[PDB]
Design a protein around this nucleic acid. Sequence first.
DNA 1: TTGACTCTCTTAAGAGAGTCA
DNA 2: TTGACTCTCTTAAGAGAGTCA
Lengths: 162, 162
Amino acid sequence: ALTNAQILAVIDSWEETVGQFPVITHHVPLGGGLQGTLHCYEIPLAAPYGVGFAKNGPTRWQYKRTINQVVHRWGSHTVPFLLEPDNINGKTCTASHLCHNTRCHNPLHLCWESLDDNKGRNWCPGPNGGCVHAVVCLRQGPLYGPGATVAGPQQRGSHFVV
Amino acid sequence: ALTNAQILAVIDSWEETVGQFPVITHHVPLGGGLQGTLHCYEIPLAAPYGVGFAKNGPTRWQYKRTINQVVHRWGSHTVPFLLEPDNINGKTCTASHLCHNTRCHNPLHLCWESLDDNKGRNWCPGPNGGCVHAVVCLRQGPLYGPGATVAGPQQRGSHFVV
DNA sequence: TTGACTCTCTTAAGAGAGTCA
DNA sequence: TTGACTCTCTTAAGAGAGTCA
Ligand SMILES: [Mg+2]
Ligand SMILES: [Mg+2]
Ligand SMILES: [Zn+2]
Ligand SMILES: [Zn+2]
Ligand SMILES: [Zn+2]
Ligand SMILES: [Zn+2]
């Protein structure tokens, strides 16, 4: 098993490498009609990505290190959380982008939470629009708003009451 | 089936059958510390379900009718919307439960919207807590709340800014 | 040990279609 | 014609593991 020291060294090498990813300034809605700025550290679009990084899917990457002759591999956004519990309330913990930018590996834009909590941030009104997330959102969710519902509740007859 | 008359006949037959489903009263959060009551028309847990209905998954059903001597079949919650566009913005339209109760087939608890709009209602604060859905929610979403995030954004070094 | 590819899987909101009697 | 089962699929937020040089 990897020791605490070895895990800390993986986290540190990951941070060193991600800290050299291009830093892109994004203007984002915060809710309440306010605009803010996020600084995303974006993995390149194509190889090479950075030492230890490889693309396993269109927007999926992994980080790999060999320690004492054993190959270890992690989801590329999971590395900041290697010293944290991997499950909570029965559910697996997932890396969750507060900036909603998959290529971003800025650990200040990531949290570690259930997939339901992760998904729900997509619709959050944002830190200046009523976010109630205990770990606060950094921006209004990209899918927040009135929606585009095609047809609402309706009946042709009188068989139903709401 | 193809004709408008045939489709209206399908909707009317579906409404008559679902209208005989047991009516279950559910007391629900509305947001803003308020509570309301919904009357769900719940498909039975086991066969028989009702004329034209059959279970294709743990919480999936289908409605089928024989028209022009051929079997026509639909997802059981899609029938109210057979005269509506089946896509929006290039996204598939889905039956979406405003009561978040899959066994319910009350068309006054259903809308027709993209899967993203559908999902997002799970986290809505509700009609008395700030719902901004143009087709308004009937209740606060079951996943609304602070969440249970295990770890928030963090770095070990000084490579990153928010 | 490392890079750059390859493959399939999970979840929870939703689907279509085939086999029998 | 109708009923009661069977199977796999879609999406968009996330995953694990293999091959080859
Ligand atoms: Mg997310
Ligand atoms: Mg829904
Ligand atoms: Zn970011
Ligand atoms: Zn939030
Ligand atoms: Zn209902
Ligand atoms: Zn709503």
